[PDB]
Design a protein around this ligand. Structure first.
Ligand SMILES: Nc1ccc2c(ccn2C(F)F)c1
Lengths: 235, 179
């Protein structure tokens, strides 16, 4: 995570992120729609941060400090590079929509009016096929990953010191290895709840209401395909 | 501080996301109530024992029977939630949720929690429920269901007013600590 993005998303809501004088210029309904759009981007930023802890902090640390066998590290963090690539791309498109919307002379005041089209693009075509394939593989390897982790933690002393060392800082309190895996798995099922609440406050422009309705269905189709392609592997 | 894991289960409208938010913030959100809960590690001291309780939600996983059980591994206590303003969410407890939680979490203590107890004496709630020939869940109806499913205990709370919220999570910590 970068200081610019953390600062832009430090507030608990869009209503508290923007200047008070800018907030006053908007209707109650627009403030509610923006609050939920901000929550979606803030939680996506947290999600991309979670995948970076898994790749840079855990995966890379095990390869360089512990010199663990690449197939062991793969078993622990299945599809982490593909997952990181899907969500860093999605996050980039969301922050670019926020950036274009900023008022001239401001780094915090903005209103996103066309989120729907970005969501339809992400959850359709090749990007939807890649999310479906990646989560079906990741989720099918979830139990095998936790079992491999517990075995290593209980049988190797150098692995235990490594884990205790890298997860010691307060900023890693919710981000242990197993916690990161469950955070990633639960991410996909958060999207329909967020999109539906954005849709509830997006009745002003008919085109936007239709785009968000299409996007909601594409997310549910994706979730249904991932759910149906899951089977827990067992070693 | 030992580490324990808590998972909240129940229907979409049982109010489980709001309970996790009010507990973790120790405040009912004044400006904005979040749509989603990611995770949280609570520092709880119950009966002189310090515990790190990791809190998890299952909201969004109700329709996906193969994604949902991925939240269960190594759970130490289950908060099985229902809404007091919804007699229908109480019906789903022994049929769908209890057999699932006993299959994926054998021998794990379950606390049946009655959410939204503030609506038990809300007139809008009482009039609306009468159109479908129903009424708010009585405290004894909750106790009987908790006894029937073999729950560790039965508790009630109101996320709106924070009443009974701290006690729910303190009792969950106590249950997670037992053999
Ligand atoms: N005996 C058994 C096996 C699997 C079960 C249950 C209840 C839910 N599931 C699961 F597949 F979701 C019960």
């Amino acid at each position: 995570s970068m200081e610019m993005d953390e600062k832009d998303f430090a507030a608990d809501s869009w209503s508290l992120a923007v200047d008070s004088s800018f907030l006053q210029q908007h209707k109650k309904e627009v403030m509610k729609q923006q609050d939920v759009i901000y929550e979606l981007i803030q939680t996506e930023l947290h999600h991309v941060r979670t995948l970076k802890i898994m790749t840079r902090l855990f995966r890379t640390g095990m390869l360089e400090e512990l010199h663990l066998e690449p197939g062991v590290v793969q078993g622990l963090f299945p599809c982490v590079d593909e997952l990181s690539d899907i969500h860093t791309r999605f996050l980039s498109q969301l922050l670019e929509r926020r950036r274009q919307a900023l008022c001239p002379g401001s780094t915090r005041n903005f209103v996103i009016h066309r989120l729907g089209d970005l969501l339809i693009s992400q959850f359709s075509g090749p990007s939807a096929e890649q999310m479906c394939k990646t989560y079906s593989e990741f989720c099918s390897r979830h139990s095998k990953a936790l079992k491999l982790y517990k075995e290593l933690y209980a049988r190797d002393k150098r692995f235990q010191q490594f884990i205790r060392k890298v997860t010691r800082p307060a900023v890693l309190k919710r981000h242990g290895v197993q916690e990161c895996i469950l955070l990633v798995t639960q991410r996909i099922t958060k999207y329909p709840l967020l999109i539906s609440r954005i849709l509830q406050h997006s009745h002003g422009i008919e085109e936007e209401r239709q785009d968000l309705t299409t996007a909601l269905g594409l997310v549910k189709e994706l979730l249904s395909n991932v759910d149906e392609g899951i089977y827990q592997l067992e070693k | 501080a030992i580490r324990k894991k808590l998972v909240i289960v129940g229907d979409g409208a049982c109010g489980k996301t709001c309970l996790l938010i009010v507990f973790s913030k120790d405040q009912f959100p004044e400006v904005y109530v979040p749509t989603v809960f990611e995770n949280y590690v609570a520092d709880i001291e119950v009966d002189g024992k310090q515990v790190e309780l990791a809190l998890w939600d299952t909201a969004g996983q109700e329709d996906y029977d193969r994604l949902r059980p991925l939240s269960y591994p190594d759970t130490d206590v289950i908060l099985m939630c229902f809404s007091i303003d919804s007699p229908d969410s109480l019906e789903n407890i022994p049929e769908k949720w209890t057999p699932e939680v006993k299959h994926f979490c054998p021998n794990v203590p379950i606390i049946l929690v009655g959410n939204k107890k503030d609506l038990r004496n809300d007139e809008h709630t009482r009039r609306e429920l009468a159109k479908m020939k129903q009424e708010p869940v009585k405290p004894e109806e909750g106790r009987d269901m908790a006894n029937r499913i073999g729950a560790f205990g039965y508790m009630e709370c109101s996320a709106k007013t924070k009443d009974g919220v701290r006690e729910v999570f303190e009792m969950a910590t106590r249950a997670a600590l037992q053999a």
